Amino acid sequence: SKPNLLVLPVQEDASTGLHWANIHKRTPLMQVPLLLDLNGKHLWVTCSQHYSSSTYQAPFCHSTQCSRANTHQCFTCTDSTTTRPGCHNNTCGLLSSNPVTQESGLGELAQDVLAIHSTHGSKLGPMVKVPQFLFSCAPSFLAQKGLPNNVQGALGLGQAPISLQNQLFSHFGLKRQFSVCLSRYSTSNGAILFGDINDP
């Protein structure tokens, strides 16, 4: 029941020339538009008051999740007077970057469902899940500039312990390899492939 190849369709934004993907997250599953950032250290989302998920968690400071993410700096919400995703006390802080504007901001480590297509024969197959995907809940200002319209964060494929591919490789036991085929046209998708492309 474990896929050997996963596929993420990506699209070019004509205005900015950047590429983004709809990523599936949460329970119930929904789509988040995020910027494709090849060198990015992690996936981050602006997490709002209206974040809805029955599988969302904020790891506690000094937890194993915070260790894996390589952060041992504790988070204090200096914002709201009530908690919400992205706003708790005694969690851990993670620095996220807008790669276009080079702004950075301190977010809170988060955990939720991520889903992605597997393959079925020669076609796209059913979505498969990483039930405890680690990512950053970033401060809202961080996505307000430089990104494609309605894009709310970025997915990072960099060489770092909680990068997107690193978590997909280890959850499903994939070959440590990913492939990029970006499309020039805003009107048709390109893709990212995770796993071995050479076992015909």
Ligand X SMILES: *[C@@H]1O[C@H](CO)[C@@H](O[C@@H]2O[C@H](CO)[C@@H](O)[C@H](O)[C@H]2NC(C)=O)[C@H](O)[C@H]1NC(C)=O
Given the rule CB under 8 A, which residues bind other proteins? Answer: 2, 59-68, 72, 132, 159, 161, 169-174
In whole angstroms, what is the distance from residue 198 CA to residue 152 CA? Answer: 34
How far is the C-alpha of 44 from the C-alpha of 141, rounded, in Å?
13
Which of other proteins, ligand X, none sits in contact with 68, Cβ below 5 to 8 A by type?
other proteins
Min dist CB 106 to ligand X, Å, is 15
Quick one: which of 81, 102, 122, 187 contacts ligand X (CB under 6 A)? 81
Residue 82 interacts, among ligand X, other proteins, none and using kind-specific CB cut-offs from 5 to 8 Å, with ligand X
Collect all residues with Cβ–Cβ distance below 8 Å to 80 and sequence separation of at least 6: 87
The residue type of 130 is V
Work out whether 100 is an interface residue with ligand X (CB under 6 A). no
Q: Report the alpha-carbon distance of residue 157 to residue 130 in Å, rounded.
A: 16
Asked if residue 49 binds ligand X (CB under 6 A), the reply is no
DSSP character at residue 148? P
Grouping H, G, I as helix, E, B as strand and the rest as coil, residue 67 is: helix
Q: How far apart are CA 78 and CA 89, in angstroms?
A: 9
Query: Which residue's structure tokens are 């080079």?
Result: 102
Counting contacts by CB under 6 A, is residue 83 touching ligand X? yes
Measured from the CB of residue 29, what is the shortest distance to other proteins in angstroms? 20
Cβ-closest residue to ligand X? 89
**77 contact choice in ligand X, other proteins, none (CB below 5 to 8 Å, kind-dependent):** ligand X
> How many Å from the N-terminal Cα to the C-terminal Cα in the chain?
19
Contacted entry of other proteins, ligand X, none for residue 122, CB cut-off 5 to 8 Å set by kind: none
Site for ligand X contains 159 (CB under 6 A): no
Choose one: 8-16, 51-59, 82-90, 138-146; the region binding ligand X (CB under 6 A): 82-90
